Amino acid sequence: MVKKWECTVISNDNKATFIKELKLAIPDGESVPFRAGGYIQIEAPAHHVKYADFDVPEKYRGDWDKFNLFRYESKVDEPIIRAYSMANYPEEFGIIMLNVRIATPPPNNPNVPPGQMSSYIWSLKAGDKCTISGPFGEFFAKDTDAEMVFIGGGAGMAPMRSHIFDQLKRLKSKRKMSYWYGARSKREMFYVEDFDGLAAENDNFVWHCALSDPQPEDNWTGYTGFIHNVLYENYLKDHEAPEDCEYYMCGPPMMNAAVINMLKNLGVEEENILLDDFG
Ligand SMILES: Cc1cc2nc3c(=O)[nH]c(=O)nc-3n(C[C@H](O)[C@H](O)[C@H](O)COP(=O)(O)OP(=O)(O)OC[C@H]3O[C@@H](n4cnc5c(N)ncnc54)[C@H](O)[C@@H]3O)c2cc1C
Ligand SMILES: NC(=O)C1=CN([C@@H]2O[C@H](COP(=O)(O)OP(=O)(O)OC[C@H]3O[C@@H](n4cnc5c(N)ncnc54)[C@H](O)[C@@H]3O)[C@@H](O)[C@H]2O)C=CC1
Ligand SMILES: NC(=O)C1=CN([C@@H]2O[C@H](COP(=O)(O)OP(=O)(O)OC[C@H]3O[C@@H](n4cnc5c(N)ncnc54)[C@H](O)[C@@H]3O)[C@@H](O)[C@H]2O)C=CC1
Ligand code: NA
Ligand code: NA
């Protein structure tokens, strides 16, 4: 049942301004027996970390400097635990990959404490230990032949990647599949080579990214605006049977609400709407 692993951090690089990909090596090269969409728990001891010690690459530091985010510190005097979704799929053996947003204090409340566990995770470097437990889960794919529409935003990426690779690689699915991902700007995109490669290799999979706040330096000529509107205008509006698809979503609360509203207005039933709310 519930097992615990004292893992070793392989890498903990930024994938976006405010997202790190934590890669963990499982002891003895064993694999966590998880399902795509599932999660583990990370636990951490009492500790004290400083944002100034974070490894944030130059290309991502712009908004860190703009909003003086390196000011922050997190002192935690009790053990803590949190859930994080796997970004790897089950046959990426011997590892656990996470996509962790740094939960800074809100702008209108800049002096409340920073997020406890995400600050701790962003402190980790290669060779550090990280204890996880699980696996757990409920955000699982349905076992049908229905067309799948995956809708991700921001820091909701991880279960989308896990799901999509699980279908196309482990299950060798022939189901029609698409992924619609909303990012603020081009530097906030990630897993581009992974999804481009899957799309190129699988005639039943395509993906699209929309930028809601494209930046002058992005030279962006792709889709813009909120991902739900892009998905509607460029695919679902013309679809002959949107109610016949299964929708799997993980994104900001406002994205989830806009998506659900749009789908219900197309006649999609709740049975066909699955989402993972991180709380
Ligand atoms: C099943 C599941 C899967 C998940 N998967 C992911 C995932 O893939 N990636 C991911 O990034 N997260 C994921 N989460 C969320 C994750 O578990 C944490 O909730 C998240 O990392 C924030 O926790 P934290 O300890 O860093 O912040 P907390 O310490 O819980 O704080 C949250 C926020 O509250 C703010 N805050 C603190 N005090 C105050 C105050 N007085 N007034 C106002 N605001 C205040 C903090 O600054 C911070 O912004 C998942 C959650 C679940 C349940
Ligand atoms: N940890 C995170 O996920 C953070 C995300 N951001 C996001 O970056 C974008 C910044 O937009 P820009 O066009 O560059 O500038 P801007 O000044 O126009 O940003 C607009 C909003 O950024 C918000 N913001 C969110 N987190 C903030 C933080 N920690 N400190 C200060 N302001 C914060 C403020 O409410 C402001 O209203 C916003 O989308 C903001 O939400 C910014 C800071 C941290
Ligand atoms: N599954 C969950 O519960 C998740 C929750 N979040 C939370 O959502 C907030 C924003 O997270 P970020 O990763 O910085 O996202 P973000 O601010 O970078 O937004 C990501 C994408 O979401 C869509 N979106 C954002 N605001 C929207 C709105 N008002 N209407 C419609 N679509 C919108 C856009 O397509 C945007 O590109 C944070 O508080 C984060 O904790 C984020 C991701 C997943
Ligand atoms: Na990026
Ligand atoms: Na394709």
Numbering used by the authors: 129 to 407
From the paper:
In the human pathogen Vibrio cholerae, the sodium-pumping NADH:quinone oxidoreductase (Na+-NQR) generates a sodium gradient by a so far unknown mechanism. Na+-NQR is composed of three integral membrane subunits, NqrB, NqrD, and NqrE, and three hydrophilic subunits, NqrA, NqrC, and NqrF. The six subunits NqrA, B, C, D, E, and F of Na+-NQR harbor a unique set of cofactors that shuttle the electrons from NADH twice across the membrane to quinone. Here we show that ion pumping in Na+-NQR is driven by large conformational changes coupling electron transfer to ion translocation.
Subunit NqrF consists of two domains, an amino-terminal [2Fe-2S] ferredoxin-like and a carboxy-terminal FAD-binding domain, which is similar to ferredoxin-NADPH reductases (FNRs). Both domains are connected by a flexible linker and are anchored in the membrane by a single N-terminal transmembrane helix. The C-terminal FNR-like domain catalyzes NADH oxidation, and the electrons are transferred via the ferredoxin-like domain to the integral membrane subunits NqrD and NqrE. The mode of NADH binding was further characterized by X-ray structures of the isolated FNR-like domain of NqrF, as well as of a variant of NqrF lacking the C-terminal F406, which is important for binding of NADH. Once NADH binds to the FNR-like domain of NqrF, it is oxidized at FADNqrF; this is followed by fast electron transfer to [2Fe-2S]NqrF in the ferredoxin-like domain of NqrF.
